[PDB]
Enzyme design. Sequence first.
Site, short mmCIF file in Angstrom:
data_model
loop_
_atom_site.label_atom_id
_atom_site.label_comp_id
_atom_site.label_asym_id
_atom_site.label_seq_id
_atom_site.Cartn_x
_atom_site.Cartn_y
_atom_site.Cartn_z
N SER A 42 0.80 -1.22 0.00
CA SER A 42 0.00 0.00 0.00
C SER A 42 0.83 1.28 0.00
O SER A 42 0.24 2.37 0.07
CB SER A 42 -0.95 0.01 1.20
OG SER A 42 -1.94 -0.99 1.05
N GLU A 142 -4.80 -7.43 -4.85
CA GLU A 142 -3.94 -8.34 -5.60
C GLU A 142 -2.50 -7.86 -5.67
O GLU A 142 -1.59 -8.68 -5.83
CB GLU A 142 -4.48 -8.55 -7.01
CG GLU A 142 -5.61 -9.57 -7.10
CD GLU A 142 -6.98 -8.96 -6.91
OE1 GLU A 142 -7.12 -7.73 -7.09
OE2 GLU A 142 -7.93 -9.70 -6.58
N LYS A 208 3.49 6.57 5.32
CA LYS A 208 2.44 5.75 4.72
C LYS A 208 2.94 4.32 4.71
O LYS A 208 4.08 4.06 4.32
CB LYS A 208 2.11 6.22 3.30
CG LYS A 208 1.08 5.36 2.60
CD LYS A 208 -0.22 5.36 3.37
CE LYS A 208 -1.07 4.15 3.03
NZ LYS A 208 -0.60 2.92 3.73
N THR A 209 2.09 3.39 5.15
CA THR A 209 2.53 2.03 5.43
C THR A 209 2.26 1.10 4.24
O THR A 209 1.69 1.49 3.22
CB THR A 209 1.85 1.49 6.69
OG1 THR A 209 0.42 1.56 6.55
CG2 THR A 209 2.30 2.29 7.91
N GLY A 210 2.71 -0.14 4.40
CA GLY A 210 2.53 -1.17 3.41
C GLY A 210 2.67 -2.55 4.02
O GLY A 210 3.63 -2.81 4.75
#
Length: 265
Positions: A42, A142, A208-210
């Site tokens: 993300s 996805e 901002k994360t992922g």
Amino acid sequence: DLADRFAELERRYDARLGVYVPATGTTAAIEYRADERFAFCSTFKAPLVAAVLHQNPLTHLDKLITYTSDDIRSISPVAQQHVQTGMTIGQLCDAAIRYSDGTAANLLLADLGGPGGGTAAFTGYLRSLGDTVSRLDAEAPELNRDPPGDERDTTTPHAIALVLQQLVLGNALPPDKRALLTDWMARNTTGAKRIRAGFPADWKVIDKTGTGDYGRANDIAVVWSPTGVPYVVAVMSDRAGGGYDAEPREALLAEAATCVAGVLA
């Protein structure tokens, strides 16, 4: 030896780890696996917002977007509470970053280049910023689920740190839109246990994360010293050798940030 310190972090967490802090006028660049490929997850939603901010006037952020409950195909904390009401482009930007809302990002992708080519327009925006390596080939969720070695939905710590360098501190966005992308990242609610946890309180952090399969845990961020000096910190990781269901480790990202904080403090 800092390279060895990160290498020890990899052994302790049984993970791969990538770090890039760009060089400043007074500090050198920190780089570890910064040219290897890691999945966006993300993290692409901050530059995605920048693409939308860049291509449209500020009034476009008042455009009302409607959708259905069948459009909710990923973790969407905000979008699934406002189906009947609809969400604004600004509200979609607010949700895509602060809550990592996957439907909001999927809507902004469609806002970028239509239903089918949102991923192709996002990559072109990165190509417009000097990113020749990053690519987005699917939408949420996805894009979190490619196998190791697949180049789809991957960037590098070096690439995304430089892109975010252009966006928050550089000239890629006009200053009023710059302040909007900065403000939303400044109030992100998903990254209290990542880079923010590896920096002392007096340092201001936006991020901002992922997160994704194969233990993927990422965080891109810009930090400000107590005297107001800015730094870009991109930290990416995965625990691929443990399988697609490997547990992401937020602590690995904040210990890596603590190592970086020791170099910059």
